[PDB]
Amino acid sequence: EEPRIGVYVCHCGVNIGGTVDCPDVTEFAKTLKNVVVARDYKYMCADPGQEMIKKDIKEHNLNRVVVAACSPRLHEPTFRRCVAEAGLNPFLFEFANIREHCSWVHMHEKEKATEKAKDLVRMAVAKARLLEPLEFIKVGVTQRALVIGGGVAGIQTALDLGDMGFETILVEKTPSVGGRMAQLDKTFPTNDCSICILAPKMVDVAKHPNVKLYAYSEVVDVQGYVGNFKVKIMKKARYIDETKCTGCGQCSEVCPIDVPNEFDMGIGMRKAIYKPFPQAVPAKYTIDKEHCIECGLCAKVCGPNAIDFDQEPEIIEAEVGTIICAIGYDAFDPTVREEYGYGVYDNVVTALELERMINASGPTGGKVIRLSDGQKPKRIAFIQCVGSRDAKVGNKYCSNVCCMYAMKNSQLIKEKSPDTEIDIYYMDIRAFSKGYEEFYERSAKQYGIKFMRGRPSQVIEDPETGNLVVRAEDTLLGEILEKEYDLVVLSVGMVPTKSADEVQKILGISRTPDQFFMEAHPKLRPVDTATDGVYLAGACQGPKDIPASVAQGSAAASRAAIPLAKGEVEVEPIIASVDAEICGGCGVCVKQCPYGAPRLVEKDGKVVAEVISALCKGCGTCPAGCPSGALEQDHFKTIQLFKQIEGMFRDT
Amino acid sequence: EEPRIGVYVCHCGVNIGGTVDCPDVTEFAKTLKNVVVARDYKYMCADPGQEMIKKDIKEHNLNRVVVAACSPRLHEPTFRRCVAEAGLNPFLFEFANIREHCSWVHMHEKEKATEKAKDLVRMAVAKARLLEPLEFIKVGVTQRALVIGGGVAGIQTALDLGDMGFETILVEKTPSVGGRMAQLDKTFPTNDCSICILAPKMVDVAKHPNVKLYAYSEVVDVQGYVGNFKVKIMKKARYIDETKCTGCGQCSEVCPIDVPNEFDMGIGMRKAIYKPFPQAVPAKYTIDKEHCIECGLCAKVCGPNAIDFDQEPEIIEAEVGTIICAIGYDAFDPTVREEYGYGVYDNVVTALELERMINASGPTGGKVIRLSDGQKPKRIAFIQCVGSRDAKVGNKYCSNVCCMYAMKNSQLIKEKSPDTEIDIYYMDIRAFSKGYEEFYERSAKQYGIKFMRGRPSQVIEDPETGNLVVRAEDTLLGEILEKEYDLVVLSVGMVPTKSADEVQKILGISRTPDQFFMEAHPKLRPVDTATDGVYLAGACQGPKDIPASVAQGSAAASRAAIPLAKGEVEVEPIIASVDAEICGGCGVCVKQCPYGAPRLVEKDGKVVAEVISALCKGCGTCPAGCPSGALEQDHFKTIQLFKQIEGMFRDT
């Protein structure tokens, strides 16, 4: 049968129509071979727009549909479901991107944008003619979830999925769950003890009947697709018998190697054999082989003889249906902003280091003290937006929680020592959520915390006393201030965690300009990724506070529970297949596939290649490399792409 | 059985110990009758502290445990689980608050604070002796959910629950779903049309096999408890047969009565027979009997003969297990800030009215025009924080979205008319989330939008031209500005919706100081309420944007899916019960219960009262009002409270 194409040009209100002359593109589409219906509408994805396509498919007997509008990455599934409801196979639908790829980037070149939209429509129509009906492949869903990261976001996802009755696996990189929330003393805007409220959730997730906790473990490999993921978890060796470990801590006293305690942000010193924090879950000790000298002094003191250097990491193979990435964030390193002197001046600290100094279980015993002489500071300055809203460090985003934690920690210091003078150097006070503006009012009115509108130019240390001078313009007075302080606290921003690169490659997910993980859509899908079966939750998706991370943890559980609850999902049949009559078994395709899908086999007395359909992810590398043309990727066949290329210059 | 009490005095590091002499309180606890074990520890909620109680329950055969520490509102579940793990019934545990109620508020009166701690311990020990072992009530869960409000948040909850396989009911007050998002033209920070994200979701929810949509309907009654709610939905009469209606709108072109369109904020004119907006769902019409003259002109053009003036509202009785409140918000009415002249000056508009003016399907055809002469403004001023961060109007909170929508609408006006001059009068620019700070940078750098740091004192109209003058101090220059504008846009804040009072009474939920709905906990249960089985999602819980409302919608689906998935939930046994041997059926208790749990019945030939256990919420009002003493609330019995009162002055 000959193609009967329906072309739809969206205006997207004025997003497309305001730059591209949609009525003119619609008239041009009609001049193309096989195009029998062409219409322009304000919103093609809206009810009237979708009903218009369906009605035309039936009335004009269309076997191809072209929608010139937004990106397929946003509404391709939406229009595929729309055409399928009218009886048209979803793979006979073609998208032409004239918004993100045209109207939004050629706003001052309307005529050339209109001509580009015509060519993009002709290219879409050209490929559409040779598109073929493909059967959406129905695949089963393994009734099991995987959560990567055991912070407040990850713990919430696992608890929600576990409570729903779904088997869940929670992998935590460090020896304990809890994340950065465990490092905080209190939490704004209620000033609740962070661990005193998080600990119950850590306890709950550790003994949940539907949650398998793998602490001090890392996901080293993920293979497959939605509902059929095959994951490899490396249970790292603590070199201490897990079951015989009491958690008393007497073998550390003899260890001669001092390692900076990561949990205390480098202020504290721990041994090669240790426990992250006193309320850690699971409560067990670990040996760090990156700094261990293997002298065996700890083993002599240890009664249980739990210490075993011959311990080997275990690779656990698990099958899951959905994966939730909740690996969190890291604090920005302010060494780069040299004018502030971090790493040079002893009394210049970050806010996360202050959290630890303020924390009762911290290295200073909950006492805020100068690192140069151990004395309590009488005057403190907070410097906002350090590593945020700054093009010089490549971080042009708002870290979201720094205004609030600076005001919170200032209240905690005033509670401990009311005589302390505290000044906050800011640009904008961002107290945007429930009880936040009130917290800001309270900080000034009740605690006497002072606010200076002006981003400091530099910090100068007095080498004789260790005191610091903050140079900044009080923009509200139009005068330069040069106030002296005993301690300067840099309100550092949030950056993706160090392991984010490793996790990105394993899950096959993208990043946003801020370097955090990319959600499928900022409003249509805040916790989904463009990779089916992979979701996000917490700070790893972008800078945010606890309730936002907790809500995202719950949102991810719901979204990841949909495929599990359904028990069946549909996958794109854009896979490679070999034409046995043309393949002479050259073997070029075999090594090109990273999944090992194409394999040489015997057929009709001779050798030929054959693709294991289930192992093909549909990249199109082996068909591109096939020298005989026997290998072809459905939906991206060479002939289809060839006509698309012709479509840019002429009607084919 | 004789009470064997274990008393534990927490130091909370120095939070309690630094004011209260804990060792002295422990010595005093030992002098009380039945106290077998008394110990003081740094952190009672920590692993060593919890294990110390468990070990003592076993080794000293305790049948009562008293913990003198912080608030039960913080660690009551924690210590309940701790004692239950040692075999002790959780209702034989008593909490004494010596931190929030003593050490933290009597810091300068240590001696009196220690004597207060001793009395609080004696009061706890006194009640503890008469505490009894109790068991939780297990109840079934109806496999069905109810969502109130069909905005982006409510639609997301219903779609997620439906996709999970749970039957869901979505009740929408107005004739169409979509909410305030439907009124917006574009949406920050992507500047997508609001329709781009919302319409497909509206279409999906309207034809979902697991979602029953009741548009133009309201919940009039809710009875029961978690997993056993009995709801009454009033399907308001549209006076049109929905199944016969096509939604063509031939009727609207004939109707002679003009009613102000509520959807366009009074700026638009609709007919008696109307459709809220062109992309409305369901695509059906509605007759407003408040303004219909019943001429029957619309019925003559209606082909399928759907119009029926004899339509009566239907009361639908439905049984649900969980309820999600997503009723949204209303825009603040700026008439009260009289210095700005809203409702007095024709060219002073709200931001929500501007959304309708800018919208292509709006009353002005997407043209921003002055309401005094219909001309397009060349100079526009945006006034931030109108009805927010203001004690004079009783709204001391940040409305969260006004900074971003002002910058977004300014970008949109610049796109339609680049010659337009736009100034934004602000205090703090709150662009706190992903891509928000970048959107703010873009507004100034790309669109040339100007920012004036200064909250305007007043707006003065020129009665002769209709132009407005904005009086404000440019705080960054220390000079007073008196710039003239063609249009002044008030960036109005968010307030709870008008129906919020009705919904609050029906669901039995609380409100936070901002008047929005109260979540169970700000940090860990952001979408739950203290009322089991009732959840929140969207702007009705607090001012927030679409990404946050969508994530909350998904978070609520997950949380509301837990009881449904479990199929069984537990209810607290701290309920009222009647002692049949003492009750002579006086009937005083019956009308005191707002849930109607206590009921009169015939037993052994005589009248006696009986409480329906599942219906009791545990307030203790009817036992307090019982004149015979037959009615008692377990855990708060009169004898228990009597001993507690004695405990303040003496032992026992």
Ligand SMILES: Cc1cc2nc3c(=O)[nH]c(=O)nc-3n(C[C@H](O)[C@H](O)[C@H](O)COP(=O)(O)OP(=O)(O)OC[C@H]3O[C@@H](n4cnc5c(N)ncnc54)[C@H](O)[C@@H]3O)c2cc1C
């Ligand atoms: C100084 C400061 C003060 C703050 N104060 C407050 C406050 O008062 N109130 C508030 O609400 N918020 C505050 N915040 C924000 C708060 O820290 C975050 O909201 C919160 O930690 C988010 O939790 P998360 O689970 O998403 O990530 P995280 O807390 O960082 O946890 C991530 C977890 O994943 C693990 N992980 C990382 N990589 C891997 C991997 N490859 N495999 C397995 N596991 C991995 C980590 O070890 C960690 O346990 C503050 C932030 C800072 C920096």
Ligand SMILES: Cc1cc2nc3c(=O)[nH]c(=O)nc-3n(C[C@H](O)[C@H](O)[C@H](O)COP(=O)(O)OP(=O)(O)OC[C@H]3O[C@@H](n4cnc5c(N)ncnc54)[C@H](O)[C@@H]3O)c2cc1C
């Ligand atoms: C001028 C303006 C511009 C904005 N611009 C943006 C933007 O660009 N980007 C962005 O992200 N956010 C923006 N916002 C915020 C955005 O409007 C909200 O985030 C969003 O509408 C919240 O969705 P919701 O469902 O929670 O509330 P709503 O949109 O208000 O939905 C509530 C729904 O419940 C229904 N309802 C009410 N009462 C009852 C009842 N008793 N029974 C049944 N149903 C009921 C209502 O009719 C309504 O349909 C803007 C807000 C304003 C005022």
Ligand code: SF4
């Ligand atoms: S390794 Fe031995 S000494 Fe160290 S905590 Fe474990 S049991 Fe105690």
Ligand code: SF4
């Ligand atoms: S063997 Fe390793 S952990 Fe043990 S004492 Fe020596 S360096 Fe420390």
Ligand code: SF4
């Ligand atoms: S939240 Fe406050 S301190 Fe943090 S980057 Fe944004 S404006 Fe700066």
Ligand code: SF4
């Ligand atoms: S590359 Fe082409 S010809 Fe060679 S073995 Fe593979 S399918 Fe056959």
Ligand code: SF4
């Ligand atoms: S197209 Fe070829 S190389 Fe790519 S995943 Fe499929 S079989 Fe492997």
Ligand code: SF4
């Ligand atoms: S039990 Fe309460 S008072 Fe004692 S350490 Fe814990 S939080 Fe602080």
Ligand code: SF4
């Ligand atoms: S989202 Fe796509 S189809 Fe919908 S109105 Fe915007 S451009 Fe058109």
Ligand code: SF4
């Ligand atoms: S009531 Fe009749 S005329 Fe009006 S839209 Fe419905 S079908 Fe058309």
Ligand code: SF4
């Ligand atoms: S009968 Fe009512 S709805 Fe119909 S045209 Fe007359 S006023 Fe309008």
Ligand code: SF4
């Ligand atoms: S978001 Fe902006 S305009 Fe709105 S109340 Fe907060 S600071 Fe004021």
Ligand code: SF4
């Ligand atoms: S008030 Fe007391 S005595 Fe009277 S009916 Fe109720 S339980 Fe019986």
Ligand code: SF4
């Ligand atoms: S104690 Fe309160 S809720 Fe319970 S039966 Fe009596 S009045 Fe009703």
Ligand SMILES: [Fe+3]
């Ligand atoms: Fe505690």
